Design a protein around this ligand. Sequence first.
Ligand SMILES: *[C@@H]1O[C@H](CO)[C@@H](O[C@@H]2O[C@H](CO)[C@@H](O[C@H]3O[C@H](CO)[C@@H](O)[C@H](O)[C@@H]3O)[C@H](O)[C@H]2NC(C)=O)[C@H](O)[C@H]1NC(C)=O
Ligand SMILES: *[C@H]1O[C@H](CO)[C@@H](O)[C@H](O)[C@@H]1O
Ligand SMILES: *[C@H]1O[C@H](CO)[C@@H](O)[C@H](O)[C@@H]1O
Ligand SMILES: *[C@H]1O[C@H](CO)[C@@H](O)[C@H](O)[C@@H]1O
Ligand SMILES: *[C@H]1O[C@H](CO)[C@@H](O)[C@H](O)[C@@H]1O
Ligand SMILES: *[C@H]1O[C@H](CO)[C@@H](O)[C@H](O)[C@@H]1O
Ligand SMILES: *[C@H]1O[C@H](CO)[C@@H](O)[C@H](O)[C@@H]1O
Ligand SMILES: *[C@H]1O[C@H](CO)[C@@H](O)[C@H](O)[C@@H]1O
Ligand SMILES: *[C@H]1O[C@H](CO)[C@@H](O)[C@H](O)[C@@H]1O
Ligand SMILES: *[C@H]1O[C@H](CO)[C@@H](O)[C@H](O)[C@@H]1O
Ligand SMILES: *[C@H]1O[C@H](CO)[C@@H](O)[C@H](O)[C@@H]1O
Length: 339
Amino acid sequence: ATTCTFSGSNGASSASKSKTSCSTIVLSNVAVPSGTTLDLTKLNDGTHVIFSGETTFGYKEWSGPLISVSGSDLTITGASGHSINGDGSRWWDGEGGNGGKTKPKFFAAHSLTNSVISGLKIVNSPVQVFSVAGSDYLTLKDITIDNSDGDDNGGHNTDAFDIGTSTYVTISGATVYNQDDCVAVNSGENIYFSGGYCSGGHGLSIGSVGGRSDNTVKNVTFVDSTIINSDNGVRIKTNIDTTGSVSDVTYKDITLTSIAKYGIVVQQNYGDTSSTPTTGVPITDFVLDNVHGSVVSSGTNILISCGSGSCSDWTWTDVSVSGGKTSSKCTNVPSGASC
Ligand SMILES: *[C@@H]1O[C@H](CO)[C@@H](O[C@@H]2O[C@H](CO)[C@@H](O[C@H]3O[C@H](CO)[C@@H](O)[C@H](O)[C@@H]3O)[C@H](O)[C@H]2NC(C)=O)[C@H](O)[C@H]1NC(C)=O
Ligand SMILES: *[C@H]1O[C@H](CO)[C@@H](O)[C@H](O)[C@@H]1O
Ligand SMILES: *[C@H]1O[C@H](CO)[C@@H](O)[C@H](O)[C@@H]1O
Ligand SMILES: *[C@H]1O[C@H](CO)[C@@H](O)[C@H](O)[C@@H]1O
Ligand SMILES: *[C@H]1O[C@H](CO)[C@@H](O)[C@H](O)[C@@H]1O
Ligand SMILES: *[C@H]1O[C@H](CO)[C@@H](O)[C@H](O)[C@@H]1O
Ligand SMILES: *[C@H]1O[C@H](CO)[C@@H](O)[C@H](O)[C@@H]1O
Ligand SMILES: *[C@H]1O[C@H](CO)[C@@H](O)[C@H](O)[C@@H]1O
Ligand SMILES: *[C@H]1O[C@H](CO)[C@@H](O)[C@H](O)[C@@H]1O
Ligand SMILES: *[C@H]1O[C@H](CO)[C@@H](O)[C@H](O)[C@@H]1O
Ligand SMILES: *[C@H]1O[C@H](CO)[C@@H](O)[C@H](O)[C@@H]1O
């Protein structure tokens, strides 16, 4: 049972070169050369990866990812005291991924099967953090993402978890301070998020759905989590004039604290909210159970922008959201739900 340690400025290199010879690879204070990826791709089945000390990256305008892992039956963890520091303020310019500097994505969790990622502390990502894709039976456990420095420092589009084309993804105990979605499920099945703390971002959202390879969202559960000081709490966004499916989505035991814009928001006209919502991405079997909290006074409690017939079978129990205005602009609200 081999064990390998890579450190410093040439660690990334050695790591990529010897990873298939190491049952356990320990990354200690590795400084990743600018414009390169920590390539942890295609590890041997069962590999263990330990992040130790402080991981850093050289500065350069590129698209990332800074880190990339793939493989089977993998275990990847963060040692006590470790941190993985993006020092994103080198790139933050207020324009995020839609302009200005090209900023690199942080973590490509692609093509992972039966694997666990836990205890990772990520600090100041340049732009989105976790990109989850084409993965099955993936656990993201006790992850901390602190981009709080970006609040008044031009951080934009710092999504914590972007999910697509994946099944059986479980996210538990995440702590997130950012400036965009805490979670965004673009597609996938059998997804479960529990015990999270989402601060400063744009909420726990399904979507945006439609206009991609995979436009199906099914069996998603958010439970026992807090959304605090964010623009939105509960959000389902489907792209206008697209096709797809959203069904079997549950939000349960959700706490909303000081939500700035929308406590609960469902828009089937996402991408152009000045237009009537379209009907190609129906939302059925939407369940809210014990969602409660506060919206600021200049905010809106609940906004529901559904198309004709494209929203049905919604079960809303114990929903108690208040402090904001009540919208007069909801459309085609399913029975049993209300604004
Ligand atoms: C809707 O999605 C739910 C969450 O993904 C899903 O529950 C989860 O189901 C999986 C698989 O059945 C359970 O995991 C099992 O299989 C692996 C493989 O050996 C074992 O390691 C596990 O111990 C377990 O036996 C999860 O435990 C389970 N998660 C929850 C929170 O209970 C539902 O089955 C999906 N429901 C529908 C109707 O599709
Ligand atoms: C690689 O080297 C480091 C330095 O001791 C260890 O922590 C690790 O377990 C492996 O031996
Ligand atoms: C970082 O730590 C490792 C431990 O094996 C060394 O191999 C390397 O030279 C650097 O000191
Ligand atoms: C190792 O070398 C790299 C690049 O030469 C530095 O960025 C790092 O701080 C360490 O000196
Ligand atoms: C990075 O450094 C290592 C040293 O082991 C090389 O093998 C690799 O090809 C790259 O130059
Ligand atoms: C990466 O690490 C290996 C040994 O761990 C070295 O051989 C190489 O030169 C680079 O520092
Ligand atoms: C990581 O880097 C090594 C050499 O630095 C390659 O051998 C490997 O395929 C991957 O690019
Ligand atoms: C990659 O790292 C391993 C560590 O044992 C070396 O054996 C190899 O030569 C390469 O530098
Ligand atoms: C642990 O696993 C590594 C590869 O994952 C082997 O190189 C080692 O011999 C042991 O089986
Ligand atoms: C390498 O070392 C880690 C932790 O020491 C083990 O979990 C792994 O199985 C391999 O022995
Ligand atoms: C990223 O920027 C560094 C400067 O520190 C270069 O060394 C590297 O080649 C890349 O352009």
